[PDB]
Amino acid sequence: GTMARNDGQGKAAATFMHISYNNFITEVDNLNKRMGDLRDINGEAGTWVRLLNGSGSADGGFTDHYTLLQMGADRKHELGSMDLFTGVMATYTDTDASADLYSGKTKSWGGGFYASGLFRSGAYFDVIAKYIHNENKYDLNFAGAGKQNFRSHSLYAGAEVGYRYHLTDTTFVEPQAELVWGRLQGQNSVNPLVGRTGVVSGKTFSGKDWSLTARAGLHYEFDLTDSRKDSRMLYGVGLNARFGDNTRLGLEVERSAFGKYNTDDAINANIRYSFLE
């Protein structure tokens, strides 16, 4: 009757929202994860592919897993002591999520543009704007709600800056700060905001025509459903490899602790081909 339906309605609105916010959070990236190392590339154009597979968990019995496949193309402009990459990208995501109240799958596509600036000083920025469309198909385990299909979408803007400080010829530390903001609308209009501050340190090995950089990162991250507060420490290890002049590979694994929502495991990989005209 009315009381059960109102309770149901409340649970459905909370669920729609959790899933919508989850779809946004899942897309939050950073320069190294998407693009790998962009320093000192001898090539005026590039193509890249990035894959991410990972799992998160939170309260309410929440657990999810996602796969992200992204590809992009850019041009490099050398302008004084700045290398500027301007590019475009397409994205796809498949996510499986469940909690005490629901179980289901979201399939998404999106795309956007980015500009990444790498300075001879060691400074860098990365700015991105993208669109993400989500198709959600979920069982609601409550109020005879059954199977529910609904769509959401969002606008995403991100700005990250950072600065590489060499300690020696082959080691560095790189503090970083990022802020991501969005407008999320689904069948709610909320404006999430996620921020991160952190440090990566690195050790580079090399031979005559290859290099391999081992990386360790530790970051503070906070996230707001509406610009409902959560925060966590992220811990990552990675490598970035160069083979000759044209091919790079990046790999990063990550986990978080202390969040209400955590990343329990995630492996990110990307390959970049860079080429002279």
Cα separation, 268 vs 27, whole angstroms: 12
- The answer for 195, left when phi > 0, alpha when psi is -120 to 50, beta otherwise, is beta
**Both ends of the chain: CA-CA distance in Å?**
70
CB burial of 41-73 (b: ≥16 within 10 Å; e: otherwise) equals beeebbebebebebebbbeeebebbbebebbbe
Q: Distances from the Cα of 197 to the Cαs of 1, 105, 219, in angstroms?
A: 49, 31, 6
What type of residue sits at position 71? M
- Quick one: three-class SS letters along the chain? CHHHHHHHHHHHHHHHHHHHHHHHHCCCCCHHHHHCCCCCCCCCEEEEEEEEEEEEECCCCCEEEEEEEEEEEEEEEEECCEEEEEEEEEEEEEEEEEECCEEEEEEEEEEEEEEEEEECCCEEEEEEEEEEEEEEEEEECCCCCEEEEEEEEEEEEEEEEEECEECCCCEEEEEEEEEEEEEEEECCEECCEEEEEEEEEEEEEECCCEEEEEEEEEEEEEEECCCCEEEEEEEEEEEEEEECCCEEEEEEEEEEECCCCEEEEEEEEEEEEEECC
Experimentally, how was this structure solved? X-ray
Query: Domains in the chain, ordered, with CATH?
Result: 1-277 (2.40.128.130)
What type of residue sits at position 126? D
Listed resolution, Å = 2.0
What type of residue sits at position 245? D
Residues belonging to the chain: 277
Cα separation, 274 vs 257, whole angstroms: 36
Cα separation, 22 vs 213, whole angstroms: 32
Cα separation, 223 vs 262, whole angstroms: 12
Q: How many CB atoms lie within 10 A of CB 146?
A: 8
The answer to whether residues 70 and 49 touch, using CB atoms and an 8 Å cutoff, is: yes
The answer to whether residues 214 and 239 touch, using CB atoms and an 8 Å cutoff, is: yes
Q: How many CB atoms lie within 10 A of CB 274?
A: 21
The answer to whether residues 186 and 34 touch, using CB atoms and an 8 Å cutoff, is: no
Cα separation, 80 vs 119, whole angstroms: 9
Q: How many CB atoms lie within 10 A of CB 228?
A: 9
Cα separation, 164 vs 220, whole angstroms: 18
Cα separation, 64 vs 50, whole angstroms: 20
The answer to whether residues 248 and 272 touch, using CB atoms and an 8 Å cutoff, is: yes
Which two tokens mark 67?
A: 């796969």
Which two tokens mark 248?
A: 């790079």
33 phi/psi in degrees, rounded to 5: -65, -35
Which two tokens mark 16?
A: 């729609």
Cα separation, 37 vs 46, whole angstroms: 13
| Dihedral sign from CA coordinates of 194, 197, 201, 204 | positive
Cα separation, 224 vs 193, whole angstroms: 5
84 phi/psi in degrees, rounded to 5: -115, 125
